[PDB]
Design a protein around this ligand. Structure first.
Ligand SMILES: Nc1cc(C(F)(F)F)cc(Br)c1N
Ligand SMILES: [Zn+2]
Length: 197
């Protein structure tokens, strides 16, 4: 009915990381630690770091799924709006209905859940690159938060789950997302609203 959003590092110490992109008017993606909220432009690269304390088993995967943040909307499937699901901006792999895409990974798989009808995109863990300390996945959000007939100004969360080869839970993290024209301005505004309040 409703996916859990409880943060869970699990045995491998799984958690997300975000770049420090700032809040200039020109910024296309920016993360607010105080709000735990990502602000991004439509269909632009959102780099999300995946951190672990130890390497999970071969066959481990990382899934992304959106849900509505407000409880009274949480049972509604988050999907692209009636305009964007029809605008033929297919990358050849993502179904046109899916809000969240993975960029530049030919091993990405897109799931329409047969029971819940929710959408998700999942990628397989690969051996850690030599010299690096984390891995980065690049997501795209394919509707504005404001899209009528879709998210319709309702806030969403992205839930990132670390899964074993059967789909069982190994780890979980999450963040709010606003897809908007001016992420820098909106992050500054919402952080100011938080400070005042
Ligand atoms: N090496 C690696 C580690 C992780 C983890 F989520 F475990 F951090 C996710 C991915 Br995708 C890769 N490729
Ligand atoms: Zn839309």
């Amino acid at each position: 009915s409703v996916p859990s959003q409880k943060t869970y590092q699990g045995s491998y110490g799984f958690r997300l990381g975000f770049l420090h992109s700032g809040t200039a008017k020109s910024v296309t993606c920016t993360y607010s630690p105080a709000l735990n909220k990502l602000f991004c432009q439509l269909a632009k690269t959102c780099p999300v770091q995946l951190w672990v304390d130890s390497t999970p088993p071969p066959g481990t995967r990382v899934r992304a799924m959106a849900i509505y943040k407000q409880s009274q909307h949480m049972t509604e499937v988050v999907r692209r709006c009636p305009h964007h699901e029809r605008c033929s901006d297919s990358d050849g792999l993502a179904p046109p209905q899916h809000l969240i895409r993975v960029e530049g990974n030919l091993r990405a798989e897109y799931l329409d859940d047969r029971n819940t009808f929710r959408h998700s995109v999942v990628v397989p863990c690969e051996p850690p690159e030599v010299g690096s300390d984390c891995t980065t996945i690049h997501y795209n959000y394919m509707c504005y938060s404001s899209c009528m007939g879709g998210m319709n100004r309702r806030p969403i969360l992205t839930i990132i789950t670390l899964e074993d080869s059967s789909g069982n839970l190994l780890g979980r993290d999450s963040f709010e997302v606003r897809v908007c024209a001016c992420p820098g301005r909106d992050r500054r505004t919402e952080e100011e609203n938080l400070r005042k309040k």
